[PDB]
Enzyme design. Structure first.
Site, mmCIF file in Angstrom:
data_model
loop_
_atom_site.group_PDB
_atom_site.id
_atom_site.type_symbol
_atom_site.label_atom_id
_atom_site.label_comp_id
_atom_site.label_asym_id
_atom_site.label_seq_id
_atom_site.Cartn_x
_atom_site.Cartn_y
_atom_site.Cartn_z
ATOM 1 C CB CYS A 196 -0.920 -0.025 1.216
ATOM 2 S SG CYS A 196 -0.042 -0.449 2.738
ATOM 3 C CG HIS A 250 -3.162 -0.468 6.867
ATOM 4 N ND1 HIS A 250 -2.884 -0.658 8.203
ATOM 5 C CD2 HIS A 250 -3.414 -1.695 6.355
ATOM 6 C CE1 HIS A 250 -2.971 -1.944 8.488
ATOM 7 N NE2 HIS A 250 -3.291 -2.595 7.384
#
Ligand SMILES: Nc1ncnc2c1ncn2[C@@H]1O[C@H](COP(=O)(O)OP(=O)(O)OP(=O)(O)O)[C@@H](O)[C@H]1O
Ligand SMILES: Nc1ncnc2c1ncn2[C@@H]1O[C@H](COP(=O)(O)OP(=O)(O)OP(=O)(O)O)[C@@H](O)[C@H]1O
Ligand SMILES: Nc1ncnc2c1ncn2[C@@H]1O[C@H](COP(=O)(O)OP(=O)(O)OP(=O)(O)O)[C@@H](O)[C@H]1O
Ligand SMILES: [Mg+2]
Ligand SMILES: [Mg+2]
Ligand SMILES: [Mg+2]
EC number: 3.4.19.12
Lengths: 173, 361, 50, 328, 262, 76, 372
Positions: free
Chosen positions: G15, G320
């Site tokens: 990510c 994230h």
């Protein structure tokens, strides 16, 4: 409630209520809830003042700044047996107050108050000590360390002047 | 180490100390020889904020000199032993009063108002700095000074500028804040407001707007004004000497001085009473110059011309001409502000739209 | 004694609210059985909209 | 804050001593800030935004309605004054930095109703795309006194944190009015929050990009320190449309309507006396009810005439054909 | 059916700990204040649609670590029970038979734009808004309002004006603000304010009633009736025969469009 | 040289290094004065990452330059 | 077929790489550069061997972007890029933990490394677009004894330093370029305090402001995260950080940029039933700044966001990345990328990322100039 208890183990107690106008209020409770809060606390007093609980060496001194605010059950004699009024200082009652406050300050030597003070009325007892404070500013202006009757005579004019800013009117029983 | 309960002390009611042969208490117990059997040493009763009281044997490292019968203490939460002492509690709004060091706007951002400055330093500052000469004089300081007069004169501006200039602890308080629909929590901001102030003494307590708690009423009929005045009355109580308020002062600003309570006419609350006048000829000229120094002008400006042609304009109006001129300058499209523009800001912005319709006036 | 110069009766203010609901009570669950039994000292002191 | 632990009082009212975990920063604890502590052993994990007491000021935050910026009537000049005070320094504080002046922030909206007092402020809400926080003056009055003091104070400081915001004071004729004494009133308790409005505007700190509008129906009664000229800086009287101004408004309105061409928007203005455009918004719609009555898809001259009579006659039957409550 | 409920109950409680959502944070968290007392900084399981819940919601907290298990859609007051209605009048129109041309002003601006917006699209511009009914008492004002509500079959709120006048202040404005906020919330509504003549002739005590109470409530109504809210459809019907105790911004046009004299 | 590292803490420091000594030595001396381990440090000059075994002469840095100390984050 | 960009898939939680790539493609001149370029078109390498890898990285980006245009892949293939960066930078070839997990890179670290690969392939002209030139005044405090003017001071991202007393964008940004530096100085003793202030001389075509919500605790000796909400609008105007002489030039072109902006709000409705503004900004370009065009000079001071890199995470903990990228095909349209999830967000939702407290912290503010 528990303050009266304290008063019965401690000898000859003297209960000064200072500047009470808070619970002095009347029955009101058409206003806010605060007025029933007053009420709850007020009922508490009456039962103490007179009942099977009786005092004799517990005394009430009640200090207020206007007595017609109060509820008349706090104007009730035998709980309040003597109603002593202290008026405004009198024509030569200011003179008597002045002679104790000229000892505190540094002075050239002043025993010439008498005429000026009587004809500068409008003073309470705390303003006499404000004539001395304001006369110590007139002194500071001159760069003096003493209260002069030159400083004093400008002071009584000033101090009277600033109190005419608002009036006060009060009537009594 | 954390965490522990925070509490106050009901009382220290000590028991006699442990050296005896028959009990070591102040309250007689049945039976004989005892020294640790049910006997205990000195006693501290503490009241929690979880709302009980516990009779604990006080810790033998914490003294009765570190204990007052109101003192704020740590108490170990797991088992109640007085852990430490801590300073007295303060509410967050009372922590919000304290100084940030607001900048000084020195007497040079002030226009006119000489007489006002003189009395201000005289009333508050000098009793602090020449506090020896007040004692040598034999007099007491004046407890505070009232600032009053029509809005527009920079009442609030001057107080900030000069308190910061001479550096005395500047407490920021707005009177409506004392008004609360709580009682015993909103009244408590007053209580904490002096407890704080005596520690950080000498200090000036600046109350802006003394009509929210400065109600002339204390004969109230059927209203919630009896809730309001209880923060008026608790003020008058700590403006009385039960000493540790001699070094704590008051400044107050207010729009109107006919709405005050008769217990604020008296000396001992605000002894000196300063009025803010509507501007003078000289004063008006000064004020304009103080705003226009910020912005860029041309070199054909005469500050007396403008000051003649404005009569009975208050400082807020005058601020409102100097800004107004540069509006007109932007509309013409310039990068400099003429002397003709300030003249047109007289008419565009005053206080009133024209004299009115007159039909035979 | 400010409710008699304020509304002619503060009870009648409430009485007015009931009575207007009552107008369509001819069937909402099949007509009335809740009656308004009203009472007073006279009707010259009742509102003339009652 | 104790300088080198902290004292927290929980919402469960219960006071404890706490410190710093390893997701905390010490530079990040401020007085009156809310924090999260462990439900078991109280220790700060994640600080949290200050002040949970406001929750009804999140419903007075408003998205900008697209009433469009051209929606406002006329190309008259009173709204162009506004574009100098409020709108332009948000777009360009350069020109005000070149001037060096302090940029004006406040402005009064006043004048008769039906002139679209709030309708130009919905337009300006379209253009500036700054936050609009809308206040109702009667929404500032609560059952107990001092409760609305909390409201106003906190609302302001939340707007200080917000950057490029505008607070639109609507309908503050109640709270906002003049100060006076009653000696037994119940007006005093209201006047508390009236005062609370003063003490935040000037403050002891300036308004950092808070543009301020007051909308009053009436100048006939207002505070003289919420109408002092340095904190409402330029005040714009909003007027009745002229004999040209009604023609402009009615053209915005009839261009929006299907009418069959060759008509005069001049003629209808003449027939009317000096009047509102909110009437002009209703000359069209009542003429349209006469359009459906004749079962036209269009609107013609005939039905306009009937409409003009209809509104005027009811105006006479009603207040504010002379009401201004004197002053200018 | 089986598998959706299974793993729905696996995160869902046993005790479901009613909370009250003060405000949300956009990091998958919120601060709830429970009516029992303690606040909590709660997580959110977040199969419940991050952005579907708003201040004033009733939320289900988990009996262990308080997470927002779910969200209750709706809740109500007994003060809006007075507003809302269960009724279905057994009278329909032409039990108002007679006065049958001053009733084309109340079914061409109340009934019809709900029934046909198509007609007002041919002409375009905004459709009608508002009426004030006025005339002598007993001339049918009361039944007129209740007769258009049987035809239209849209949320009919009816509120008396003697309940808008209260003996307590501050809650007056909150009541008046409410009516139209509920009303806009259901997309169609017709709000009957019966007796707006009752706001100057009814008043309790004079220290929590009086001028002040009456002025505020009127002020509130201006914002609500039109103001800046842009709330839902609230067609308004007012009955009155004291029309000169109302504001000029009330009887202003465009909140009254065709006014009916009887 | 004398080179300077403006830290995120809000202070600038001085470091005594040689331009012929690498970026690794620079991080070692920051570790002495700050305590940040010398592998969380990302030192930027000219928008270019500075890597160990490259001297302060391969990125031609010279005194009166400010390298800006930023610290990496992990994802996943 | 699809109507809005197809997402990117995780490869073990890449990510941090996905987030950078999307935003980099919204950078106007970047997306042209990688496609226009071709290997063995005249560029060659006699220097470092990492130049060869740099040129693959440019290719690898260009193929992913080609797949991104296509609507017959419902998820783009990063795969080809991953390996060249692992060879190029072995920082990315490490394990952060076992299990098929690699070293989770910072988004800043990739932004700089990618930019270095591109700046060498396309040379100095491309470098200037992301880089800010300063006109630095190094002055002795307590009465200058010298002026050193530096135009070799440059970053590709301005540093906005927050010590929990900045909470507004203008502060910290302004006060990281202003600093006091201790310098060995024969002027005033053997150490003197010089005030070093960098004011922006030439604006970058593309602006990056780097927010610092990361912190090193010197008290537990552990990283932590500044949890202060930093409020800022969409819309960044630079004239507090401009050099006084250069400020005059830049404002004037900006003034005309607002003018044509007003007209577009009406006119966009007519034409439906980029040249308008650019043509105006180009004509001004030549008057205020050297002829035709230059790299790293942007007369516009209005900056519209093209992407924010949002992190969810704390101390040094694994997190994230999410990315929000500006839609260039619809104006005031934004795409939310939760890597595989793609949602429609308005421009208004972007400001809501100014919060935090545990997550949704803006880490990088990606701007494009509005005149470009
Ligand atoms: N005498 C003055 N000289 C220079 N500026 C002044 C003067 N009086 C007022 N001003 C200007 O007017 C501004 C507003 O004044 P301020 O609001 O502080 O005054 P005030 O008397 O407290 O009025 P109010 O509280 O009623 O609003 C000041 O910030 C200052 O710039
Ligand atoms: N200047 C205008 N141009 C076009 N339409 C107007 C104008 N002024 C008013 N209107 C129309 O009238 C409607 C209602 O007016 P509005 O409610 O804005 O009045 P107001 O000025 O807020 O009065 P008050 O607040 O005292 O009731 C608007 O929605 C609009 O359709
Ligand atoms: N014009 C009419 N046509 C048919 N029925 C009528 C008419 N006028 C009155 N009625 C009958 O008289 C009734 C009593 O009327 P209602 O109580 O609704 O009158 P009102 O005018 O609303 O009274 P108030 O003056 O007290 O407000 C109605 O319920 C209705 O059936
Ligand atoms: Mg003031
Ligand atoms: Mg309005
Ligand atoms: Mg009826």
């Amino acid at each position: 409630r528990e303050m009266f208890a304290y008063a019965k183990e401690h000898e000859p107690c003297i209960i000064f209520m200072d500047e009470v106008d808070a619970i002095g209020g009347r029955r009101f409770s058409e206003g806010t809830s605060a007025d029933r809060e007053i009420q709850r606390t007020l009922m508490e007093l009456l039962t103490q003042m007179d009942g099977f609980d009786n005092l004799g060496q517990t005394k009430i001194i009640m200090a207020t700044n206007r007595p017609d605010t109060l509820d008349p059950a706090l104007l009730r004699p035998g709980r309040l047996d003597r109603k002593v009024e202290i008026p405004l200082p009198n024509e030569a009652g200011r003179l008597e107050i002045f002679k104790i406050h000229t000892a505190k300050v540094k002075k050239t030597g002043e025993f010439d108050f008498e005429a000026a003070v009587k004809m500068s009325d409008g003073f309470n007892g705390a303003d006499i000590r404000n004539c001395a404070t304001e006369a110590g500013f007139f002194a500071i202006r001159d760069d003096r360390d003493h209260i002069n009757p030159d400083d004093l005579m400008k002071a009584v004019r000033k101090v009277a002047e600033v109190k005419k800013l608002e009036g006060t009117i009060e009537y009594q029983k | 180490q954390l965490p522990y309960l925070v509490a106050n002390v009901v009382e220290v009611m000590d028991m006699n100390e442990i050296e005896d042969k028959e009990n070591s208490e102040s309250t007689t117990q049945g039976g004989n020889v005892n020294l640790d059997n049910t006997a205990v040493g000195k006693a501290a009763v503490v009241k929690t904020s979880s709302r009980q009281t516990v009779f604990l044997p006080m810790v033998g490292l914490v003294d009765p000199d570190k204990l007052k019968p109101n003192d704020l203490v740590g108490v170990n939460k797991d088992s109640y032993l007085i852990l430490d002492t801590l300073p007295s509690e303060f509410d967050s709004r009372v922590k919000a009063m304290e100084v940030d060091e607001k900048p000084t706007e020195t007497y040079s951002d002030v226009g006119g108002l000489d007489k006002q400055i003189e009395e201000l330093v005289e009333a508050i500052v000098l009793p602090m700095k020449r506090a020896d000469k007040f004692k040598d004089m034999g007099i007491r300081a004046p407890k505070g000074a009232l600032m009053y007069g029509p809005p527009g004169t920079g009442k609030t501006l001057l107080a900030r500028a000069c308190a910061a200039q001479t550096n005395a602890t500047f407490l920021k308080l707005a009177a409506p804040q004392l008004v609360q629909m709580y009682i015993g929590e909103g009244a408590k901001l007053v209580r904490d407001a002096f407890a704080l102030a005596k520690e950080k003494a000498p200090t000036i307590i600046f109350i802006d707007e003394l009509d929210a708690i400065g109600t002339k009423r204390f004969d109230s009929e059927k209203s919630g004004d009896r809730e309001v005045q209880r923060t008026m009355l608790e003020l008058l109580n700590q403006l009385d000497g039960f000493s540790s308020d001699d070094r704590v002062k008051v400044l107050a600003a207010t729009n109107r001085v006919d709405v005050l309570d008769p217990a604020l006419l008296r000396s001992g609350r605000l002894d000196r009473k300063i009025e803010f006048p509507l501007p003078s000829e000289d004063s008006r000229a000064q004020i304009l110059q103080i705003h226009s120094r910020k912005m860029t002008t041309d070199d054909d400006i005469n500050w007396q011309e403008l000051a003649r042609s404005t009569d009975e304009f208050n400082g807020a109006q005058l601020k409102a001409v100097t800004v107004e001129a540069g509006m007109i300058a932007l509309r013409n499209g310039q990068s400099s502000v003429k002397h003709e523009d300030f003249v047109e800001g007289i008419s565009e912005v005053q206080a009133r739209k024209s004299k009115s319709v007159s039909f035979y006036a | 004694s400010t409710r008699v110069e304020g509304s002619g009766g503060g009870d009648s203010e409430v009485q007015r609210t009931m009575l207007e609901l009552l107008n369509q009570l001819d069937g909402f669950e099949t007509s009335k059985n809740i009656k308004i039994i009203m009472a007073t000292n006279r009707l010259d002191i009742l509102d003339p909209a009652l | 804050i104790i300088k080198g632990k902290y004292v927290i009082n929980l919402k469960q009212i219960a006071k404890f001593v706490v410190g710093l975990g390893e997701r905390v920063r010490p530079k990040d604890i401020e007085e009156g800030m809310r924090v999260g502590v462990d439900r078991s052993k109280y220790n700060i994990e994640l600080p949290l935004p200050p002040r949970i007491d406001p929750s009804v000021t999140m419903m007075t935050v408003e998205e900008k309605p697209d009433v469009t910026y051209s929606d406002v009537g006329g190309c008259k000049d009173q709204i162009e004054k506004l574009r100098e005070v409020v709108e332009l320094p948000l777009l360009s504080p350069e020109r005000f930095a070149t001037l060096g002046i302090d940029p004006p922030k406040g402005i009064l909206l006043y004048g008769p109703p039906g002139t679209g007092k709030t309708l130009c402020a919905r337009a300006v809400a379209n253009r500036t795309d700054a936050t609009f926080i809308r206040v109702i003056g009667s929404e500032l009055v609560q059952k107990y006194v001092g409760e609305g003091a909390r409201m106003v104070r906190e609302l302001f400081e939340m707007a200080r944190t917000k950057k490029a915001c505008i607070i639109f004071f609507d309908e503050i004729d109640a709270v906002g009015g003049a100060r006076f004494d009653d000696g037994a009133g119940g007006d005093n308790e209201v006047q508390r929050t009236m005062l609370e409005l003063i003490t935040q505007l000037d403050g002891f700190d300036p308004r950092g990009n808070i543009k301020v509008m007051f909308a009053t129906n009436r100048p006939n009664t207002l505070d003289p320190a919420l109408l002092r000229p340095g904190r409402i800086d330029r005040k714009v009287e909003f007027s009745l449309p002229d004999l040209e101004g009604r023609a402009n408004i009615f053209r915005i309105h009839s261009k929006s309507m299907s009418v069959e061409r060759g008509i005069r928007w001049e003629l209808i203005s003449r027939l009317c006396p000096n009047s509102t455009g909110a009437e002009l918004r209703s000359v069209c719609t009542e003429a349209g009810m006469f359009a459906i009555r004749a079962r036209r898809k269009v609107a013609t001259e005939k039905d306009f005439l009937k409409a003009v009579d209809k509104v005027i006659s009811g105006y006479k039957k009603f207040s504010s054909t002379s009401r201004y409550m004197q002053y200018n | 059916q089986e598998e959706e409920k299974k793993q729905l109950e696996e995160i869902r409680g046993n005790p479901l700990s009613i909370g009250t959502l003060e405000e949300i944070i956009d990091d998958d968290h919120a601060i709830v204040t429970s009516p029992t007392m303690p606040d909590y900084y709660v997580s959110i399981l977040s199969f419940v649609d991050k952005e579907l819940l708003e201040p004033g919601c009733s939320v289900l907290l988990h009996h262990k670590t308080m997470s927002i298990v779910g969200v209750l859609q709706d809740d109500a007051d007994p003060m809006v029970s007075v507003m809302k209605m269960d009724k279905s009048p057994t009278e329909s129109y032409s039990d108002i038979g007679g006065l049958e041309s001053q009733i084309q002003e109340i079914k061409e601006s109340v009934e019809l734009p709900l029934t046909h917006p198509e007609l007002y699209e041919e002409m375009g511009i905004k459709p009608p808004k508002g009426v004030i009914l006025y005339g002598a008492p007993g001339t049918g004002k009361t039944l007129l309002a209740k007769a258009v509500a049987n035809q239209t079959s849209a949320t009919f709120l009816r509120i008396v004006g003697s309940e808008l006048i209260q003996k307590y202040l501050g809650d007056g404005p909150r009541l008046c603000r409410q009516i139209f906020k509920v009303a806009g919330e259901n997309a169609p509504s017709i709000v009957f304010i019966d007796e707006i003549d009752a706001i100057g002739t009814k008043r309790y005590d004079s220290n929590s009633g009086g001028e002040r109470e009456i002025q505020r409530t009127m002020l509130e109504l201006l914002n609500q009736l039109d103001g800046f809210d842009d709330r839902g459809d609230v067609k308004v019907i007012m009955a009155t025969n004291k029309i000169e105790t109302l504001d000029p911004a009330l009887i202003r046009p465009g909140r009254i469009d065709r006014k009916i004299l009887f | 040289m004398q080179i300077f590292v403006k830290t995120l803490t809000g202070k600038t420091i001085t470091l005594e290094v040689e331009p012929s000594d690498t970026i690794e030595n620079v991080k070692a001396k920051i570790q002495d004065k700050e305590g940040i381990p010398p592998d969380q440090q990302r030192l930027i000059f000219a928008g270019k990452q500075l890597e160990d075994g490259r001297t302060l002469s391969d990125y031609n840095i010279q005194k009166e330059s400010t390298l800006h100390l930023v610290l990496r984050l992990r994802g996943g | 077929f699809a109507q809005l960009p197809v997402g990117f898939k995780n490869m073990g939680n890449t990510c941090y790489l996905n987030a950078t790539l999307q935003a980099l493609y919204r950078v106007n001149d970047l997306r042209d550069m990688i496609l226009n370029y071709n290997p063995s078109q005249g560029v060659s390498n006699s220097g470092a061997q990492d130049e060869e890898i740099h040129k693959q990285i440019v290719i690898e980006m260009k193929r992913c972007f080609e797949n991104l245009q296509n609507k017959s892949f419902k998820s783009v293939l990063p795969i080809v890029l991953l390996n060249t960066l692992r060879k190029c930078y072995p920082q990315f070839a490490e394990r952060d933990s076992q299990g098929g997990f690699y070293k989770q890179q910072d988004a800043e670290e990739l932004f700089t490394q990618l930019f270095h690969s591109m700046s060498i392939v396309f040379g100095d002209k491309f470098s200037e677009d992301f880089r800010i030139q300063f006109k630095t005044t190094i002055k002795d405090t307590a009465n200058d004894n010298d002026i050193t003017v530096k135009e070799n001071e440059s970053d590709s991202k301005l540093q906005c330093h927050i010590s929990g007393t900045t909470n507004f964008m203008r502060n910290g940004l302004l006060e990281g370029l202003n600093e006091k530096i201790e310098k060995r100085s024969d002027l005033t003793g053997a150490n003197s305090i010089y005030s070093v202030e960098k004011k922006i001389s030439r604006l970058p075509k593309f602006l990056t402001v780097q927010y610092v919500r990361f912190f090193w605790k010197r008290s537990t000796n552990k990283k932590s995260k500044i949890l202060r909400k930093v409020v800022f609008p969409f819309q960044l105007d630079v004239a507090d950080m401009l050099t006084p002489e250069y400020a005059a030039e830049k404002v004037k072109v900006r003034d005309e940029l607002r003018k044509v902006e007003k007209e577009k709000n009406e006119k966009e409705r007519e034409i439906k039933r980029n040249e308008s503004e650019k043509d105006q900004w180009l004509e001004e370009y030549k008057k205020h700044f050297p002829p035709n065009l230059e790299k790293g000079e942007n007369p516009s001071c209005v900056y519209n966001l093209i992407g924010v890199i949002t992190h969810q995470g704390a101390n040094s903990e694994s997190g994230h990345y999410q990315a929000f990228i500006r839609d260039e095909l619809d104006e005031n349209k934004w795409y939310k990328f939760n890597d595989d999830k793609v949602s429609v967000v308005e421009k208004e939702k972007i400001e809501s990322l100014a919060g935090g407290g545990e997550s949704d912290s803006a880490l990088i503010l990606m701007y494009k100039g509005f005149g470009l």
